[PDB]
Symmetry: none
Subunit: 54 residues, 6 copies
């Protein structure tokens, strides 16, 4: 047996925001789950001369 | 047995936002699940001279 | 046995937004699931001189 | 407004097994996923 | 507004097993995932 | 506004086991995940 795994991210990013998840990885049944009026009001501005590799 | 796996991302991104997911990976039955009035009002602006590789 | 797998993303993107998913990967039966009045009012602007590879 | 989610379990069961599941709810791609020789040899018996 | 989530369990069960599950709710991709020879040999018995 | 989450367990059970699960709620990608020869040999018995 030989197992090889390779996961590669070589991103260039000017503005990056992580996720906004409310009720996540919550096992077991028999419950009341309410996500009530979640709101995103956010403002993102990105301004650039150049971004990739040269 | 030989197993080779390769996942590759070479992205260039100006503005990046992760997901906005409400009730996610919630196993087990017998429940009340409500997502009530989720709202996105967000503003994203991107402005650029060049973006890819040169 | 030889297994080779390869997933490749070479994207250039000015503005990128992830998912907006309300009730996702929620197994087990016998439940009441409501997604009630989800709204997207968000505004995206992208403006560019050039974007691909040169 | 009424939301009622209701269960009455009055069952008679010898064995209740909810699942025997190998690769369940696995979102991302770009993966090698192998389920190799899953076996069920379980025995459920009543004698009287 | 009423939300009622309600279980009555009056069951008679010899064996209750909620699951026997190997790789489960695993979001990330770019992975090697192997379930190799899972076996159930369990014995549930009534004599009378 | 009423939210009621309610359980009436009046069950009779000989053996109750919530789960027998190996790799469970594991968000990270780029991983190697092997479940190798999980065996259930459990014995549940009534004699009368």
């Amino acid at each position: 047996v030989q197992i090889i795994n390779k996961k590669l991210d070589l991103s260039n990013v000017q503005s990056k925001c992580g996720s906004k998840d409310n009720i996540k990885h919550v096992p077991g049944g028999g419950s009341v789950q309410i996500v009530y009026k979640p709101v995103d009001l956010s403002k993102v501005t990105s301004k650039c001369g150049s971004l990739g590799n040269i």
